[PDB]
């Protein structure tokens, strides 16, 4: 059971690449997360049920992941900074105008390799990252108007 469940790279509400390792309503949740993210540089964690959602937005690109609530934020943010560094190096400014999923056939496997790596088990850089990354609650809406929960199935894929 890898504790990092899902990850994406997005600009605005447009997802450029994604990867999940099991089944769940990740895109439904993720799309409602994206629409709340200011396009100015920022970092944030939302706590929701037994999960946490984390991203970094930088130079308009959002690097986001969803994890169990017992994976340390340091480990999460390091995952994201690593994904980002690769994304930035490989695609540069292309990401500014890319269409939906344009990076997905190339990068989702990079996302998969890093998610695996970072999910399998220190430095001070990594814990000081966390300084001023607030933790917040998030209002998410289900189909019939009630509170939407992230509902996954670890049995899958």
């Amino acid at each position: 059971s890898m504790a990092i469940l899902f990850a994406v790279v997005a600009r605005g509400t447009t997802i450029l690449a994604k990867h999940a390792w099991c089944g769940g309503n990740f895109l439904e949740v993720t799309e409602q997360i994206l629409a709340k993210i200011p396009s100015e540089n920022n970092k944030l964690t939302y706590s929701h049920g037994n999960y946490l959602f984390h991203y970094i937005c930088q130079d308009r690109i959002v690097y986001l992941c969803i994890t169990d609530d017992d994976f340390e934020r340091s480990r999460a943010f390091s995952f994201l900074n690593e994904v980002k560094k690769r994304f930035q190096t490989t695609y540069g400014s292309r990401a500014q105008t890319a269409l939906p999923y344009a990076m997905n056939s190339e990068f989702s496997s990079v996302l998969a390799a890093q998610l695996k790596h970072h999910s399998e088990n220190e430095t001070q850089a990594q814990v000081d990252e966390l300084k001023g990354i607030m933790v917040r609650n998030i209002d998410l809406v289900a189909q019939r108007g009630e509170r939407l929960e992230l509902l996954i199935d670890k049995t899958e894929n």
Binding site: T45, D69, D70, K131, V135, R136
Partner: protein
């Protein structure tokens, strides 16, 4: 029996995660600054253990208890001393944490720091009033332990600060008859 929330909190403390601690405790579900894991580990213990000096003032600001005893009757000073965390020790000593507290093995903060070779803690503790000659349940002193474990710089510092060399541990040995024959340590124990 549900420690799952407590564990959330202590994992955040342990990771040095101030904004998480803040969210989970609701600063500026029954969690509090002094709750315990099953162990007796309070946040302050965990913070000390992992050397999270930036958390400590805040925990103490919200009422963490620096004399809280875990299941070893260890206080957070013990752990910070076991691990050699200068700023944590400093911060706690400056918030009036008491340096002469013994845990169930009869050990003290000074003895753990010396045992562990953390010389950068010795003077600091002595300044705040650690008894240089207190002994643990084996009858060992900070100096006994430094010698057994061969921490030369610690030995130096304890002798400099006047630590007795005549204390007999429970097997009738003294710092001296615990050193190597011809150790640099041995030389030191003569002057």
């Amino acid at each position: 029996k549900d420690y799952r929330e407590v564990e959330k909190l202590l994992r955040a403390v342990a990771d040095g995660d101030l904004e998480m601690v803040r969210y989970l405790l609701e600063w500026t579900s029954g969690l509090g600054v002094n709750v315990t894991s099953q162990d007796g580990s309070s946040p302050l213990h965990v913070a000390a253990l992992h050397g999270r000096a930036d958390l400590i003032p805040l925990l103490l600001k919200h009422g963490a208890n620096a004399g809280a005893r875990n299941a070893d009757q260890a206080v957070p000073l013990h752990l910070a001393c076991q691990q050699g965390h200068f700023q944590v020790v400093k911060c706690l000593l400056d918030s009036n944490a008491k340096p002469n507290k013994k845990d169930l093995s009869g050990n003290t903060p000074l003895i753990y720091a010396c045992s562990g070779g953390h010389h950068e803690l010795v003077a600091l503790l002595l300044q705040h009033g650690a008894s240089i000659n207190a002994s643990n349940n084996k009858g060992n002193t900070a100096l006994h332990e430094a010698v057994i474990e061969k921490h030369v710089f610690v030995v130096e510092l304890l002798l400099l600060h006047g630590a007795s060399v005549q204390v007999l541990n429970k097997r009738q040995r003294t710092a001296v008859d615990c050193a190597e024959q011809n150790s640099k340590i041995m030389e030191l124990l003569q002057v």
